[PDB]
Every structure is written in C-alpha cells, then in structure tokens.
Enzyme design. Structure first.
Site: not given
Lengths: 446, 446
Positions: B257, B299-302, B343, B374-375
């Site tokens: 996070g 535990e970082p991802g971003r 996202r 197509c939305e």
C-alpha cells in the site's frame, strides 16, 4: 427449502433437479460437468440460447431485424449459432470482425460499430464486404468514403445519434446534453451535418439511423422518447433533401439493452409484448410527422447470451466473519473471482448463487461469495444466503453469466480463463478450453 | 506552456524532452517506439524500476525486508529484475508461483499469499521449497500441516491478521469489525485460536505476523495503529506460550500500500522518511509491551512497478461534445481502453495524460480520454486538459500505468493485449509481445 428454488426467469430454460438433488442443465448433472471438465466452468444451455434467438426473431418480425451484439460473448461456435438462427451480427473492432470471418459468418449480415474505427478496420470491413457500418464521427465518414471509393463500391452506413435518453430497468433520464463518446447530437445540429456529408458523397449510402440508450431496460418509455427524437431528425432530413435522396433511409435501429432477470425479483416483459409496443411507437411516430414507417432493428447482446449460461464453481474455504458484536457474514471462497466475473466489482452487478451438488436441510445464513484473488474487492456476489452447512468441495453456480463475464475475463494473478462447455440434449462438448501455464507464458520473448 | 510539463514525481525517472519536442524515455523518442513496436504500448523504464527496488531495499535495511507484490505486474523478465536487485517476491495463486519458478526465482525468497489456497497450490509450494506461506484460515492451517508432514519438512508461516484499520492517502478508518475476506480477527480471539493451532503441530513454524491495511498510503498513522494492534497480539501470544515457543516469531509484516504520485498534486513522502517512521513505530510498540523489536517487512507492488511505466497511444478520433448550453468537452479517442487500463472504470483512478509527439502552442481545453470499446464507460482519463489542436495521429502517454493495468488486461471486444517493451540506456527490447488474432482464436476447439 427456499434456498433450493431455481427461479425459472433467472436459470437456463433447461434446468432441472435430480432425484439425488443435483441440478442438471440439458439433462446433465452439474457434478458430472465439474468432474469431467474441472471448475470454474462456463456451462452454456445451447437450446436456451437458440430459443432466445428464435423468439426475438419472431418478436421483431424476422432474424434480419435482430442483430446480436458480439461484445456480450463471441467465439466461432457462437457466430455459427447466430448464423444458423438467421440473425445478424454486430461487431465492434477488428478482432471481432476477424473472428466472425474466421467462422465464415456471412459479411452481408455483419454491422461494424465503434467510436474510434481505425483506417485498417474500415479497410478490412469493406474488403470483406460487410453490409453496414454505423458511423460515429465526421472523421470516420471522411475515411470510409475514401476507402469505399478506392474499392469501387458504395458502402451502406447508418449514423449513430445521441438523443439525450439513458434508460435502465423501469426508469430513464432525459438530458439536454448527453456527455459521452458516442454519436452526434441531434439537438446541436451535429447529426444533420453528418447526414449532409454522407449525402454529399458518391461512395456512401445512408440507409438508416442508430441510437443506443442503456442496459437492462424493462419498460418501453425510454425507447419511446428516443424513437420520437430519432424520427424528428428523419423529419428534418427528408424536409431538407426531399423524399427522393431520403427514400433509402429505411431503418431505425434502437440499439440494445433488452433486459434479463439476474435476480428472481427482476421483471423484464416478454419480448413479444415489448416488441409490439416498439412497433406501434415507430409507426405512430413516423405517421405523426408524415413519414412512412421505417424498419425497426434491435441489437441485443445480454438478452440472447446472458440467461442460458451459468458459472460453476468449487467451494474452497468457508470463513465466519464478525460484522457486529452479534452478527456474522459467511464468506465462501471459490474457485475463480474477478478474473471470470468482474461485473460485481465493475458495475455493482447483483447475481443469484445456489448450491447445486446437494440438497441441504441447514438453515439459510447471510453470506458473501468471494474469489481467490489477492484483493479485498474480489467479490462475486456481495449479498446472498447459503446453507449453514456449506463446506469445501460443495459446488455452487452463479446464474446468468453468459453475457459480458467471459468477454471481460483477465489473467489477474495468473489465473487462466475457465473452460467453456456447451450442453445439448444430454450431451456436453468443450467449446473453449481452459488456459494453461503455457498460455500464461506465451507472450514472453526470448 | 504548462500542458507540456511532465511532473518529475509522476513520470518515469529517465524521462526527458527532445529538441524537436518529443518525450524520450531512457534516451529513446516515444515516436520511435510507436513506429517500431506499434501502439498501444507499455513502455518500461528499466532503470527507474530497479532504482525503486534499490531505494526501498536501503530504506528498509535490506532487500530481504522488501517483498515485491507480483500482483502489480509479473512476467519472467520482471521476476529476474526482482531476484537480481535482492528483493523477495510475493505470489498469490498457483500461476504466479509457476511463473516465478519458471523464471528461476529462488523459492526461499518466495512468499505465498491468498484467502483460498487449494491443496494443490499448497502442495506445489512445499514441493518447490517456498520459504513462507501466509496462512489466512483455520482450514488452510489444517491442509498445510498435513502437506508439510507428508513432505517431511517444517513449513515457516505467518498468520494474516485483520486489525480494523483501512488507510488511504492521508487518512485512515478504524472499525470494530472489518467485514472482508482476509485474515483472522485479533479482537474476536480468532487470531489467537489460529496461533494455538500452528503451535499444536510439529510440521509448521510460526515466524511472524501479517497485516495489510490499504493502498496509496501517504502517512504513517494508519500503520501505527495497525502495528499497535498486531504487536498487542504478539504480547498476548508470548504471554500465553512463554518466550520460548515464541522466540522465533521474529517478524512483523505490515503489508503493502505504499503510495505513488498519479497526479502532480499527489504527495507521498520519500520512502527513507516513511521507513524510518515505521521503524520507530515498531521499536516503540514492542518496547511498550516488554518485547524485543521484531523485524519489519513490507510488501510494495505499485511503488516498485507503477511509476516507471507509461502507456503510449495514438489518437484516432477527436470529437467536441456539448455539455451544457455554453460548455463543451473534447473527447479524444485512443488506441486501447478499459482492456489495457480498467482502473479508471474499476476504482475511479485518476491519471496524468500528456501529448508526447510534438509541442503544441494551442490553448488547453477540458477533455476526456476514451478508448475504442463499445461501451460508454470505456473511459481512460475522465477529466483532463489537452491542447486545442490535438488531432488524429498525435501520440499521448498516460503516466504510472506499471501497476495493475497489464495485470488486469482483458480481451474485451477481441482487443488483444498490447506489446510491453523495456528501455535501458538508449536501448529498447520487446519483453511481452502483442496478441494476434491467432491468440484470440487459440482456446477454440472445433
């Protein structure tokens, strides 16, 4: 007792229960499908899907007037089904077209949609001899005209309109200015400028007008306002160009968004009833402005593909979670998640889930159906009820996953796509195979 | 003028601008990358990613205390970078494990996460010699115990805790009952029951405790309360079992996070500064309850994968849309969409978007960046500003798309995954190839 019930409006038409309490689709126990094919599994009731094609075709007078929206779910086998049932097919980008052509879908029954069609997609569409292109911008019109002239053909187009109507379930909103990507504003004169441009060219032919107004639409009222607004433009056009250049504007396409039941309480009308209302609207609206009644075309995805398919899962974990000092919610973890059904997280969709491998006599208990992804919002069914004795190894199924669940599938957490199987008359066949580790690794270079 | 600026807290570290006004990454013009590799294109600043690894490792004392969350983005190439930079790797399901093992990632530096680990995933993890398993339920504990005993090994585990803290940006929420899928409640006694269970068996070893509290976290106060609550359990544990069986509970893992800048206004603290605060928290809290200070793991991802990558697109259509009687919004349609960046739609993400192929003198104009699907909701950047002369053929880049964008990619509308390229010191190499029509058809039977 009540947790047992499979609402007939929600579940595939050919759903039954065993003498041993196993839910069957088209005569096959769900347990046998999980055994043979693994879980998670998309199970398609083929007769159900074909039924919806036929009833919708009948309701709108002809399969020619019903254009299946491929975005809901497409593969070569489904393209074949739509072909045989006599409907047309709407495709959205180059990939949907190529999959249709691969499946030998008849190009004259194909319509191409999209807000940002590339030169190369327009090029491929005309080379293939695609029947219709719904144009979305002045730029597209310029591009397509050049492409059609090059090919020595005259391309049939419709122009997509924005009429300020957004319809869902039993309501709609009318706005002065629809603030979104698609179409040209009738109100601003943008739509008439497009109509003129198409008229000014040699290589395009305007054969209709298109609007799309929402999803899960259960009433006709939104459509009626939309139809009034679209035909008002028609009146404007033939007024300015005369019934001569306009004679061929023979089609009003009111788009998709026909509603289905996700939850037992969902109450879409029978298609025959809705279609006749729509038919009366279009005739009334066109007479009201001194026009001949145009052909009504409709573009359902969900209403064809949604109800006949379920997702079958295996229960892996059951956790009792404290939610207050005295209440609990039963978290039932399952075999997939937002990878095969992102709609709950993405749109706040609500689904019906049922235990399908046995009959429980345990009392119902408030529950949340969740996936195996490393994200708290990986929730498949947010608020539901399960038997108090639900256990790992039980099978559960989520209903009406036939539309836009697989279309939206991802490999989030390296979770491969589930297998998709079609059942018909007591016979199951693999249609789409489940992804492997090799599939996961296949884009990697060396 | 100001629409030209690439905020250095937002853009990859090795971003520059040409003397011809083209944005380069690691010394390569973005226009050249689009020419060689096509668009849409994920462009990875390799040096940036490695720098992030190196500074986070240093800030936390060692790469052993920094576990990259593969869910943000994983392929063999990336697993290699992580391994080389000396960090650990968090994997979430069997597929992430398999990709890691495929890439030769050292098993002892792997940690397995998840709320619904199957017997087969647990079995493969111990067969591989995975160093840590973060257990999430009583059921997992019983499964793993049996698995480890059959293998003749002692498996190191941590227990995932729910402590009623949810942090975002500069705030947090404390709840009496977190109502979600992961972990066991400290407050209800469920956590202690799990610890007892691990202590009961011979085949497991409790080495630590885990908590994960949110995302885009810019302050330390949520972590402090979480740490207080986690270490409180630590105290109850060593109290009940004595500093003896408890000596090896050496680690407090506070999860991921860590926050990045999506927008120039975003203000995450320098990692060294936040890490030092975090260290002080852990030492203070353990001493307050008479405990030695535990190892701190993160535990970082971003914060590793996010900032070093952008998504490059070609503009296809530009439409000016009336939004009131006086105002307009410029719809700029692009090469991809919700298929490569879901996202915005999924979480309401906000992104920075910039024209990168030329310098415009045109004034800025309110805009929305939209894909080709197509939305209506296929929106990439909801509210932004673009130059008034933005036109088809211009290239734009969306910043900080390195985490959770490719991870979550889909084939919606049969739109194949984009190519991913890595750039380092003036050299580009294809890492992940773009999907073709054959990919799209490859799961089809016949």
């Amino acid at each position: 007792n009540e947790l047992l019930h499979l609402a007939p409006n929600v579940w595939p038409r050919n759903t039954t229960r065993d003498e041993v309490g196993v839910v069957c689709i088209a005569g096959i126990p769900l347990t046998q499908l999980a055994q043979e094919y693994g879980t998670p599994l998309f199970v398609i009731d083929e007769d159900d899907f074909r039924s919806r094609c036929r009833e919708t075709a009948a309701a709108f007078g002809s399969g020619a007037n019903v254009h299946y929206a491929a975005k809901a779910f497409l593969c070569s086998e489904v393209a074949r089904w739509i072909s045989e049932e006599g409907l047309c097919l709407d495709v959205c980008t180059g990939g949907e077209l190529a999959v249709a052509l691969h499946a030998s879908f008849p190009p004259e029954r194909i319509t191409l949609h999209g807000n940002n069609k590339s030169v190369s997609e327009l090029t491929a569409a005309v080379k293939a001899g695609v029947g219709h292109i719904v144009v979305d911008s002045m730029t597209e019109i310029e591009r397509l005209d050049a492409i059609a002239g090059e090919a020595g053909i005259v391309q049939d187009v419709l122009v997509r309109l924005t009429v300020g109507v957004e319809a869902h379930t039993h309501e709609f909103i009318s706005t002065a200015h629809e603030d979104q990507k698609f179409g040209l504003s009738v109100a601003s004169g943008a739509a008439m400028a497009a109509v003129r441009r198409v008229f000014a060219t040699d290589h395009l032919r305007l054969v209709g007008l298109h609007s799309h107004i929402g999803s899960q639409i259960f009433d006709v009222d939104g459509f009626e306002l939309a139809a009034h607004r679209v035909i008002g433009l028609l009146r404007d056009v033939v007024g300015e160009f005369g019934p001569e250049k306009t004679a061929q504007i023979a089609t009003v396409d009111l788009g998709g968004g026909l509603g289905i039941s996700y939850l037992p309480s969902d109450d879409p009308p029978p298609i025959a009833e809705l279609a006749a209302k729509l038919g009366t609207i279009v005739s009334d609206e066109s007479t009201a402005v001194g026009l001949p009644t145009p052909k009504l075309v409709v573009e359902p995805g969900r209403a064809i593909a949604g109800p006949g398919t379920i997702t079958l899962y295996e229960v892996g974990t059951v956790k009792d979670v404290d939610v207050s000092a005295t209440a609990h919610r039963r978290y039932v973890s399952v075999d997939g998640g937002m990878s095969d059904n992102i709609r709950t997280a993405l749109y706040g969709a609500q689904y019906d889930v049922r235990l399908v491998s046995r009959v429980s006599d345990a009392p119902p208990v408030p529950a949340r159906l969740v996936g195996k992804h490393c994200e708290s919002g990986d929730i498949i069914v947010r608020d539901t009820w399960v038997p108090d004795d639900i256990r790992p190894g039980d099978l559960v199924a989520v209903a009406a996953t036939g539309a836009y669940c697989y279309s939206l599938s991802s490999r989030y957490n390296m979770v491969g796509r589930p297998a998709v199987v079609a059942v018909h008359a007591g016979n199951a066949r693999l249609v789409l195979r489940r992804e492997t580790v090799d599939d996961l690794l296949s884009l990697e270079v060396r």
